[PDB]
């Protein structure tokens, strides 16, 4: 019926003065734009059809054409920034926001979806959607006593669009908009659907990826315990955004990091630091590095949770990017730690893997490692055991690597290596 139409036939039908013919042509366009292979978005735009679809969004008397035009415009807005821009330039934002209040759940859902695509384009279209007043009706759609009464796909689409409204930076979302959205986000973060949980966690991760004031807006809502619980989840689509959010939070003040620790997060890191997925291990080690950059009692919590052996393990064997995060964690630990804590670090076996990593072709990791060795040597001086550490670094082949670094292209690399050999 409306399958495999030409763009010219669609234009002929939409340009007719017959609402039923216009509806059939719009459905044909929807089916064309839903094609898995090279949907003809640019041809549809060139034909000048976007303004007609936008006008159809306002046909309250013909709900089917509202839905078909909404779907077609959704699939145009799902493409390039230029195609999304073509949708926005047609005046689609206010029309979709008006449709958010439709009595038909599938039309309201389609409007939510379209606004999600538009906002997902970037910060400018996100903020423009916000300025047109989308947040109030979107959140009103979720103002129910129990989210479980809503259709699964409906709730998932609402959660995803809300996450896009929290997404992107340069600039970050308006502070008032974040404050308006956060309570509903917390509620969704306590829902029991894995996709809703994943997207709510990703939204929180976006909101925490910024200055300490943003992190504080999030942490003040009391979501950190729920984030740690989700960090313990079995589904990777949930653990990944939870771990990203926790890492973001520990990039903030030591008190925010202490909220993460107080919620029991460290107890999950034995698994995370051995997780079979490379990215989980990497982000867990990065979180650890930002925790070891904190106070000495926080480093002591890391020690008490038995996590130093796991850092030694990552340093000994892991993807190189995870190993670099581990070197950073070791250098932060040695920078802020007590003498006893650095001694513990050595007793756990950090010297050999660090020395083995000195053979890397990444300047930054070599600087990190040499700085860590310098810190460890300072502690040794405080204990008068620099000779023990020198012997230990020699037996594992470390002195050879540092002597090679004495002749390195980077200035600070050779400076630090020369200083280490000269002074030790």
């Amino acid at each position: 019926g409306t399958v495999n139409w030409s763009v010219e036939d669609i234009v002929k039908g939409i340009n007719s003065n017959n609402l039923e013919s216009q509806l059939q042509a719009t459905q044909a366009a929807r089916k064309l734009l839903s094609r898995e292979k090279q949907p003809p978005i640019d041809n549809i735009i060139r034909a000048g059809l976007i303004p007609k679809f936008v006008s159809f969004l306002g046909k309250t008397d013909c709900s089917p054409i509202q839905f078909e035009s909404a779907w077609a415009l959704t699939n145009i807005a799902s493409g390039t920034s230029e195609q999304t821009k073509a949708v926005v330039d047609g005046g689609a934002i206010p029309a979709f926001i008006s449709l958010l209040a439709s009595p038909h759940a599938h039309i309201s859902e389609q409007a939510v979806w379209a606004l999600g695509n538009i906002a997902g384009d970037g910060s400018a279209f996100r903020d423009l959607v916000i300025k047109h007043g989308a947040i109030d009706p979107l959140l009103a759609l979720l103002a129910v006593p129990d989210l479980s009464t809503l259709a699964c796909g409906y709730l998932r689409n609402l959660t995803w669009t809300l996450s896009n409204l929290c997404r992107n930076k340069n600039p970050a979302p308006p502070l008032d908009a974040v404050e308006q959205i956060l309570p509903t986000l917390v509620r969704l973060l306590h829902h029991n659907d894995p996709e809703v949980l994943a997207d709510s966690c990703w939204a929180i991760s976006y909101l925490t990826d910024g200055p300490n004031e943003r992190i504080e807006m999030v942490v003040k809502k009391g979501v950190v315990p729920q984030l740690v619980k989700l960090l313990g989840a079995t589904e990777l689509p949930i653990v990944t955004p939870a771990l990203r959010a926790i890492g973001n939070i520990v990039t903030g003040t030591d008190e925010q990091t202490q909220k993460v620790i107080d919620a029991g997060a460290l107890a999950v890191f034995p698994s995370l630091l051995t997780n079979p997925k490379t990215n989980i291990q990497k982000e867990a080690t990065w979180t650890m590095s930002n925790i070891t950059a904190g106070r000495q009692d926080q480093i002591q919590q890391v020690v008490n949770h038995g996590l130093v052996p796991f850092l030694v393990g990552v340093l000994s064997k892991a993807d190189f990017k995870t190993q670099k995060e581990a070197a950073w964690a070791i250098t932060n630990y040695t920078s802020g730690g007590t003498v006893e804590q650095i001694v513990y670090l050595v007793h756990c076996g950090i010297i050999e893997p660090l020395m083995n990593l000195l053979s890397a072709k990444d300047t930054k990791i070599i600087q990190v490692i040499l700085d860590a060795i310098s810190n460890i040597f300072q502690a040794a001086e405080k204990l008068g055991e620099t000779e023990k550490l020198s012997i230990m670094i020699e037996e594992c082949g470390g002195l050879d690597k540092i002597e090679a670094l004495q002749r390195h292209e980077n200035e600070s690399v050779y400076k630090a290596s020369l200083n280490l050999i000269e002074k030790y």
Partner: peptide, 9 residues
């Protein structure tokens, strides 16, 4: 990361 945009099929 979730998709920035989604096509309805």
């Amino acid at each position: 990361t979730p998709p920035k945009k989604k096509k309805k099929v």
